[PDB]
Amino acid sequence: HHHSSGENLYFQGHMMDINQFRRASGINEQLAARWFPHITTAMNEFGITKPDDQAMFIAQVGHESGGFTRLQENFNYSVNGLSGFIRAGRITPDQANALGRKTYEKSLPLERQRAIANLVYSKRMGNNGPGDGWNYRGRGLIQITGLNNYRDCGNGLKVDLVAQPELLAQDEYAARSAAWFFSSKGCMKYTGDLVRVTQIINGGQNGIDDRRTRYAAARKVLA
Amino acid sequence: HHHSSGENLYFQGHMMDINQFRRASGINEQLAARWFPHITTAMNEFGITKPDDQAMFIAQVGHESGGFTRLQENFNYSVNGLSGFIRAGRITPDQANALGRKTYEKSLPLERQRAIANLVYSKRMGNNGPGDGWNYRGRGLIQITGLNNYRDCGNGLKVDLVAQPELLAQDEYAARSAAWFFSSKGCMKYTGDLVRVTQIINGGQNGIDDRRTRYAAARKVLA
Amino acid sequence: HHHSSGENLYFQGHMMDINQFRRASGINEQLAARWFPHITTAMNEFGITKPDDQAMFIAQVGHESGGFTRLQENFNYSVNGLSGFIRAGRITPDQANALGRKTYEKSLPLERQRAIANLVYSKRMGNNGPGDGWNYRGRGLIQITGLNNYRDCGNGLKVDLVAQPELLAQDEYAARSAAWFFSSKGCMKYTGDLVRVTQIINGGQNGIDDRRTRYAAARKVLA
């Protein structure tokens, strides 16, 4: 039978390699090289090890971050572009016209963007201070928003995100917060359940088609 | 001597890792992944940072929750099982005969259990409502019982447990309430003192041997 | 034209050869044969593929490891040799005299080397246990020191370096940890930028001239 064997070349260190990650996430080598250490360190720190859990994590994070390219929202909105916030009752039509980008403006200045954020997130998610709306705007692979959540996420990572919220726009912390979210919010209790996991992450079913495509592709590589 | 100045690779984020936790708690990887975020987030929120304190917290919670597997009591009592409650004048013989589980019954339907609980905890520990006995039954890693205690615990976590007592049966809140209990009740004032911390948590020395074994194991791993 | 369609002789397996590695690193045939597998395996695992990135990795690691010859610091210090640590406030004159190597001693006994390390790194970089100073002393091509850093590195490699820190003194892990460090800390985000990369690796500009010489040499060979 020419068997005589059964042993590991090296003790531990058996994790997803960059090739598997690249193919599973569907990104180019440049992005894969950039994110590989952060995603694996984060998955390892929180025990996201089962192939299907890893596949779902990579797929959901891939969807939320626009394919691992965006880590924060911006407020470069036109007056009409603020209609969504108006419909949600986050800003008034009057305010939208005063702050929104005008037809004759190239890009909305920071002081204007900041003003919009401070208004839209005013007295929401624990923001109870001047500048909180903008300072705690959405950041991360999986978007974290508002003082209350930067605080809870910070306690979950042992990082003072209340004092340094901008850390979530840095790769290592963006990856760790996403893994903490995925784990803490119970996504590993619904392995293989795309709809339930998406509900937990998105609080809805937005982008389910893309999430499915990403999960299917990751699962084929890892599982 | 080939000595280079020392420094941290990353800013903050220096907390117990999943492996240390799994090892110190003595549970399998599945339970470790489930509880890791909740236990660490809870310990970080209340400053349970010293190795010996973390070891004691993990061991005590480990003992109280049956190895991190039980978060609430049930009232699936047979007639004989209600012996203790009757002797303690918590319920009368007839009530126990009528509600208790009979020989022809596999288990007690919720309706029966609720009745027993509403009877046993009637007008005790602040309960002053028809279904308070059952609604405020014991929940959490470290068991919390009665309106008065869900109320105090709620003020401690800034969570309305009086309105939503069931939250203590959820991992995140079960973990936070345990950390709040451990800190508020003064367990960190007696680091390493197994007997005193046990008296504080149990109101006696019940299960002291199991607690000692768990603490020794966690201590060997963490301290 | 005597053309002919290209095509690879073999499918994949296209990596830096030992000759290229030897010339790029500037080490003897013996050391090259020793490190070749570990350096290439690590570079492949973390996607260090661009010639300029490979050249910088090899140069920086070459500098930190004293030409690929040292993988750990030692605490074989004489009483007066501990003057540096006293100046840095890591040990007292009394302790240096008690522990330091004496004139009649050929080398410092291990029990005292441990004592010095336990003092020097006490309460630093996450060390909060009795023998953490010595157990997490500097190891690796790029020196890793302290519980905090062995923990993060361990999560980055999926190796329990908290339980087995000595693994970093072994070639394979020393290589992977360096590759992980290089990638995770963002060195590939500053390809060709000697000063930026050096700042990330050293936290300063010590040995910049030598790093420059090694980089030019490696780049000349690989780029």
Query: Domain limits of chain C?
Result: 18-69+161-222, 80-137
Cβ-in-10-Å burial (0-12, 13-18, 19+) of A83 comes to: middle
Alpha-carbon span C147 to C165, nearest angstrom? 9
Looking at the partner chain, which of A11, A12, A172 has a beta carbon nearest the beta carbon of C184? A172
Is A75 near chain C, with CB under 8 Å? no
Residue whose entry in the numeric block shows the structure tokens 């004496």: C102
The closest of B106, B102, B114, B101 to B74, measured between CA atoms, is B114
- Tokens found for residue A125: 């998610």
Contact residues, chain B, for A40 at CB < 8 Å: none
Q: Measure B162 CA to nearest chain A CA, in Å.
A: 22
Contact B209, B63 (CB under 8 A): no
CB contact under 8 A, B8 and C76: no
Report the neighbours of B using a cutoff of 3 or more CB pairs below 8 angstroms: A, C
Alpha-carbon span C22 to C32, nearest angstrom? 5
Alpha-carbon span B173 to B175, nearest angstrom? 5
CB contact under 8 A, A183 and B33: yes
Residue C182, amino acid: F
- Tokens found for residue C91: 């040990």
The closest of B74, B25, B29 to B175, measured between CA atoms, is B25
The closest of B15, B57, B21 to B36, measured between CA atoms, is B21
Q: Which residues contact A7 (CB under 8 A, 6 or more apart)?
A: none
Is C151 near chain B, with CB under 8 Å? yes
Backbone φ and ψ for C129, nearest 5 degrees, come out as -120, 155
Specify the CATH architecture of the domain C18-69+161-222: Orthogonal Bundle (1.10)
> C193-208 b/e with 16+ CB inside 10 Å = b?
ebeebbebbbeeeebe
Residue B61, amino acid: V
Is C200 near chain B, with CB under 8 Å? no
Is A173 near chain B, with CB under 8 Å? yes
Is C105 near chain B, with CB under 8 Å? no
Residue B36, amino acid: F
Residue whose entry in the numeric block shows the structure tokens 């330091």: C100
Q: What is the DSSP letter of A82?
A: G
Residue A53, amino acid: D
Torsion of CA B161, B27, A181, C156, to 10 degrees: 150
Contact B99, B112 (CB under 8 A): yes
- Using DSSP's 3-state secondary structure scheme, residue B213 falls into helix
Looking at the partner chain, which of A11, A12, A17 has a beta carbon nearest the beta carbon of C45? A17
The closest of C93, C91, C94, C18 to C58, measured between CA atoms, is C18
Is B104 near chain A, with CB under 8 Å? no
DSSP assignment of chain C equals --------SSSS-----HHHHHHHHT--HHHHHHHHHHHHHHHHHTT--SHHHHHHHHHHHHHHTTTTT--B-----BTGGGHHHHHTTSS-HHHHHHHSBPTT-SS--HHHHHHHHHHHTTTSTT--STTHHHHT--BTTTTB-SHHHHHHHHHHHT--TTT-GGGGGSHHHHHHHHHHHHHHTTGGGGTT-HHHHHHHHHSS-TTHHHHHHHHHHHHHHH-
**C-alpha R_g of chain B:** 20
Give chain C's length. Answer: 223
Q: What is the CATH number that goes with domain B18-70+168-222?
A: 1.10.530.10
Q: What is the DSSP letter of A192?
A: T
CB contact under 8 A, A45 and B14: no
Residue C212, amino acid: R
Contact C141, C68 (CB under 8 A): yes
Q: Which residues contact C85 (CB under 8 A, 6 or more apart)?
A: C77, C91, C96, C116, C120
Resolution (A): 1.9
Q: How far apart are the first and last CA of chain A?
A: 29
Q: What region, left, alpha or beta, does residue B212 occupy, with left being phi > 0 and alpha being psi -120 to 50 degrees?
A: alpha
DSSP assignment of B27-55 equals --HHHHHHHHHHHHHHHHHTT--SHHHHH
Q: Which residues pair with B217 in a beta bridge?
A: none
- Tokens found for residue A122: 């005013």
Backbone CA torsion sign across C114, C119, C125, C126: positive
Is B50 near chain C, with CB under 8 Å? yes
Q: Which residues contact A3 (CB under 8 A, 6 or more apart)?
A: none
Residue whose entry in the numeric block shows the structure tokens 């390219």: A69
Q: Which residues pair with B104 in a beta bridge?
A: none
Backbone CA torsion sign across B196, B198, B203, B206: negative
DSSP assignment of A153-186 equals HHHHHT--TTT-GGGGGSHHHHHHHHHHHHHHTT
The domain made up of A18-71+167-222 is a member of CATH 3.40.1190.20:
no
Backbone φ and ψ for B145, nearest 5 degrees, come out as -135, 140
CA C91-C96-C100 angle, 5° bins? 135
Alpha-carbon span C74 to C62, nearest angstrom? 19
Contact B69, B137 (CB under 8 A): no
Experimental method: X-ray
Alpha-carbon span C128 to C147, nearest angstrom? 8
Looking at the partner chain, which of C157, C186, C188 has a beta carbon nearest the beta carbon of A13? C157
Q: What is the DSSP letter of A131?
A: T
The closest of C51, C53, C23 to C217, measured between CA atoms, is C23
Q: Which long-range contacts (CB under 8 A, 24 or more apart) does B63-66 make?
A: B63/B207, B63/B210, B63/B211, B63/B214, B64/B141, B64/B142, B64/B143, B64/B178, B64/B201, B65/B141, B65/B142
Alpha-carbon span C201 to C215, nearest angstrom? 14
Is C169 near chain B, with CB under 8 Å? no
